[PDB]
Write a protein that binds this ligand. Structure first.
Ligand code: NO2
Ligand code: NO2
Ligand code: NO2
Ligand code: NO2
Ligand code: NO2
Ligand code: NO2
Ligand code: CU
Ligand code: CU
Ligand code: CU
Ligand code: CU
Ligand code: CU
Ligand code: CU
Lengths: 329, 329, 329
């Protein structure tokens, strides 16, 4: 088999790829470096993060069904924790968790066959209580396994996207000092017991896209043009989400994320099961600002789960028109 | 195009309509008036509500796929807030939110084309933090866009309902005084900061059908007869629900709510994604009292999410029979 | 019609049955005894349980679509509560609830026709507030109604399992003494008011498989061999779950649980709606330890929702291989 090396791009973007496989099965080589660091979630709020390649989420990997994935995972010596990786895309050894546990200052190389098409979470899962703590510290990402013959719709005809954005949603449990302010810590372990108490309540303090409140707004706002077919791949490794495109729809949605399943059409809001990634296509019809949200609007607005899409193009009054502008009674 | 004016009926009922379109595409004219008022949720519990037409939920609008909807929205001068409307049925301008923001004492007229069949939430969404607050104050409703050729089942054959009921479920976050009693306020704004703290916990104090605990029980109990095919359209603008008909089933269920998708059959309980409306048909087989619930039974019973259906007709012992009555051991 | 008597086996196992019906419609006789008892949920944590046959969940009953089910339900005189049973599999009388309410020291015999294929919750539901309390005390179980002609896949071809395990997930609301320790009580009623306060927060203290933390680990660990097609039937009577097989997938999944619906394939995680039971088949490919979890990993690890599967067989390096073992940088 040919081998193909890849250079990962941080989310929400995607490394280069073909939808329809150019070749026969290949071996896909990726490398990631584990990075522990405090990140800023919001104006007043920080997280002792544990990341794949410095990002929340970890970067998107793309391959085709029946390729192999061979990943060099590196845990640099300044890190304080063992770490590993579980690919939900993979068969055996706890998704690879059982074969990839590395200490600060080790590497490991795992190969699995991508026997199943879909977008799949991958996350760290060291063992027992370390499993939820590491995930809720940001250590999760997504791999997308495209059918060899590109995407097909509900009746088997090819559909093609012009753009893919990877939206990684994550819940976090930032504990608070006696004064009601979020706590800062020097390292993750110092934060461990107080994070646990928050985690036990199952109420996230933040729920964010691409690692921070507003990360996908302002300078981070996603971009498209009328007529673009955009694929929105959305992961949530630990808790449910109900993605909605305000002003738009899901044209084709695989909310359970697996491309050989029939997608649903015309959805207003769909459902991402915690522990999973889903995918929705939408072809933009109208220019202007859109917002992509978790539709528990408390989660979208008070917790952080809002992204913006800026869309240029010609407006169509047939689809919508302000007939009479805001006027006195 | 012909224009058709409609007189809205408050939920759970529906204004008059045809399932199969009588005509070609038409323009559907609706008008609603925004009403802010304290409503009573339960014996000891009140809400500073913000409503479309005085009801929680806002009334059901019905049209056919490819019609237009032209809505006059009015915000009377005694109201204290700007308000707007986002139709999830609509394409562009944040579902119409961006073109319908009106101050107390203004109106606006929005037209959109109903290009997509299904039941869809519509809700107020003024901007930022006002978005979740206004929704959780009751400002949401549903529009149903029926395929031109009526409803079809999993294999494309026509199915027809004899009755539709619109069940609008809403979560609310009523804050409490120091003594553990729910607070009352003079206006919504006075309640804003204390409601926010409750909202941040993501735990609703109430979760109600048609605006109040027991609203669809007693005098409000829904009604049918053995042999009636009833469509139960169920909205939840902000939080998930898991509707179940006790004693019954969903014969055909579009839990994501969009009629061109294949429905599922024989369901015991289905799932309404927060931010969405779904629909289930059931043809009654047995007379007697049924309960329609959110099947987190804590939500159904402690929070308010229970409705009753009273069904008359002949009992069938073949389906169920008490073989031996309650007798001593 | 023939009558067939059954001897129930406690979960996670299943009484003997045929997948494809041996005979024409029959009458299935079952008997269960209600048992109230304190059970141990975790090292430091007990529940005033109310059970069908002494187990959480109550045992799995299996029949074929169009059979009848005739159940003798017995409430022994040492119990302190009335109790009843609602089969979600059943049509009329609140799933049988309305015809089966028995006092301590009575029995009742209910017959219903199993007109609908799928796995269905059955639970106690005495009336009003007793409904959620009795369920969250463990009184729920599952009945599985197999199509007469066995299971079929997405395109109608027969699929056959070698093993079925019934995984019953339950949320519990164990209140705590002033010192932060879980309370013990002498009887359920003594615990009623303090459990209620916990229930009102909607945050479970425990969320367990087969009635206790670790119940399906260690000596309880599920077992299979490479090449076994295992059916995992998973119930949750009151709250949602997101089952995931770590190291595996759902080959065919009916997450809403009803076998005449098309299953989805290749799922990483699926969704069990509170108030329902779902089913997933998986044919093991790799030997070793797997974990079956609720993929809110806080729920899986901090709350109790983890089971283990121990699988023997030959390892396949084509599916996965540790290319380079854990080595220094
Ligand atoms: O396949 N997107 O360039
Ligand atoms: O319609 N977006 O909340
Ligand atoms: O279409 N119901 O009268
Ligand atoms: O079966 N109704 O809770
Ligand atoms: O049908 N399992 O022996
Ligand atoms: O991939 N199991 O958390
Ligand atoms: Cu880690
Ligand atoms: Cu996982
Ligand atoms: Cu408003
Ligand atoms: Cu919305
Ligand atoms: Cu009971
Ligand atoms: Cu039930």
């Amino acid at each position: 088999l040919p081998r193909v090396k890849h250079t990962l791009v941080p989310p929400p973007f995607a490394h280069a790829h073909e939808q329809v496989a150019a070749s026969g099965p290949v071996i896909n080589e990726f490398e990631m470096r584990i990075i522990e660091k405090e990140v800023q979630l919001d104006e007043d709020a920080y997280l002792q993060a544990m990341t794949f390649d410095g990002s929340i989420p970890g970067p998107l990997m793309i391959v085709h069904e029946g390729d192999y994935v061979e990943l060099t995972l590196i845990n640099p010596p300044e890190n304080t924790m063992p770490h590993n990786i579980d690919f939900h895309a993979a068969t055996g050894a706890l998704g690879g968790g059982g074969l990839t546990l590395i200490n600060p200052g080790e590497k490991v190389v795992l190969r699995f066959k991508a026997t199943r098409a879909g977008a799949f979470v991958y996350h760290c899962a060291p063992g027992g209580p370390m499993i939820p703590w590491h995930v809720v510290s940001g250590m999760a990402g997504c791999i997308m396994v495209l059918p060899r013959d590109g995407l097909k719709d509900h009746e088997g005809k090819p559909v093609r996207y012009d753009t893919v954005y990877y939206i990684g949603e994550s819940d976090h449990y930032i504990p608070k000092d006696e004064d009601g302010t979020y706590m800062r810590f020097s390292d993750p372990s110092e934060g461990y017991e107080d994070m646990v108490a928050v985690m036990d309540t199952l109420i996230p303090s933040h729920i964010v896209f691409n690692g921070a409140v507003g990360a996908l707004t302002g300078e981070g706002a996603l971009k498209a043009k009328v007529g673009d077919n955009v694929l929105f791949v959305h992961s949530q490794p630990n808790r449910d989400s109900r993605p909605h495109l305000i002003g738009g729809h899901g044209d084709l949605v695989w909310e359970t994320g697996k491309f050989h399943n029939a997608p649903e059409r015309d959805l207003e809001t769909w459902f991402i099961r915690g522990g999973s990634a889903g995918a929705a296509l939408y072809k933009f019809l109208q220019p202007g600002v859109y917002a992509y949200v978790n539709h528990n609007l408390i989660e979208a607005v008070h917790k952080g789960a809002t992204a913006h899409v800026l869309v240029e193009g010609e407006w169509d009054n047939d689809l919508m028109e302000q007939v009479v502008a805001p006027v006195g009674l």
